[PDB]
């Protein structure tokens, strides 16, 4: 039973939520290999852990840059939530620590690369291919939302493909435990629900809208609302007129009309019948939800595996030193990390 599965999942999460793990490794325990990505207050590096010889993705955040960008509480949220959760399609936080200058989250490394990369290269996914990935997100949000968590940055750039061709969700920087409404303007322009743009309080329904955007983008090869500047993207979302490619199946268009629904009383995922409106839709008629969770379903695409440590499915970035000041920065702000 989904209900009883989720109930026990909540008991597991709550214990870790209320007593967060802290300071479970040190920088000098890892060899730094290669930068795999960069953001505004941080980067992600491939590292090797000397004691096990395991490869990980180590997220390094500059505390001073976090403070400037007003992301203190969001960073505390990210680490606190990630050490507490456990789901087959969420990338696992293995260790966390901090030093004078930086915060570190060490995650399982996913060498297959980002969905973004494969999607842009291949162009678009067929409906069964898209449906297989969407299913995993539907179950992931069902899990997260049951824990009162909103994810708030669904996009292909945050979805990695593992060695079995299943999805791993990355980047919890905007994830938040909230019962009721919240107000932060955050996300990525193409993926923002109209509520967010119009500066209303919003809730987990913004994740289900984001799923509509992702499904459209996977099946079409471009998002439903695009332009050269974000302001132009926002104008399009709030009008919310969507046009579907002629190749979209009838069922797909009807699912997307219900996900990309400006009206919250009518948006799927939000309604009295919850996720089941989504799960029991015709577009998902062929989906065996248990087998997906169990990873028994055969994946449409398996990444080229060139070994442990391989970074060929990732782009190249400029390397930059990991500087650690001799003085502690921002000690009070990040005390609980």
């Amino acid at each position: 039973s989904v209900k009883e599965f989720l109930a026990k999942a909540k008991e597991d999460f709550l214990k870790k939520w209320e007593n967060p793990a802290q300071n479970t490794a040190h920088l000098d325990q890892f060899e730094r290999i290669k930068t795999l990505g960069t953001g505004s207050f941080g980067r992600v590096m491939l590292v090797k852990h000397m004691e096990t010889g395991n490869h990980y993705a180590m997220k390094i955040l500059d505390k001073q840059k976090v403070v400037k960008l007003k992301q203190i509480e969001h960073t505390l949220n990210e680490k606190r939530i990630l050490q507490a959760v456990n789901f087959p399609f969420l990338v696992k936080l293995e260790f966390s620590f901090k030093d004078n200058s930086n915060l570190y989250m060490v995650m399982e490394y996913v060498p297959g690369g980002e969905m973004f990369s494969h999607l842009r290269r291949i162009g678009r996914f067929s409906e069964p291919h898209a449906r297989f990935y969407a299913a995993q997100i539907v179950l992931t949000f069902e899990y997260l939302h049951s824990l009162d968590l909103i994810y708030r940055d669904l996009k292909p750039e945050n979805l990695l493909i593992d060695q079995q061709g299943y999805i791993q969700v990355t980047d919890f920087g905007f994830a938040k435990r909230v019962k009721g409404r919240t107000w932060t303007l955050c996300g990525t322009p193409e993926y923002l629900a109209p509520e967010i743009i119009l500066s209303k309080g919003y809730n987990k329904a913004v994740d289900w809208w984001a799923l509509g955007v992702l499904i459209y983008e996977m099946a079409a090869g471009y998002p439903p609302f695009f332009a050269d500047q974000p302001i132009q993207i926002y104008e399009k979302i709030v009008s919310g007129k969507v046009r579907f490619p002629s190749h979209f199946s009838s069922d797909l268009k009807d699912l997307l009309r219900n996900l990309l629904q400006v009206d919250l009383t009518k948006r799927f995922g939000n309604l009295k019948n919850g996720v089941n409106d989504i799960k029991n839709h015709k577009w998902f008629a062929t989906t065996d939800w248990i087998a997906i969770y169990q990873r028994k379903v055969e994946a449409p695409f398996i990444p080229k595996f060139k070994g442990p440590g391989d970074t060929s499915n990732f782009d190249d970035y400029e390397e930059e030193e990991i500087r650690v000041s001799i003085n502690e920065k921002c000690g009070k702000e990040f005390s609980e990390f």
Binding site: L69, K70, T188, D228
Partner: peptide
Amino acid sequence: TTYADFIASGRTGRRNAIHD
């Protein structure tokens, strides 16, 4: 075509998150 317009746009690369 819509594909052509997307590919000619400045938002075919990795998209940055926003916040206030």
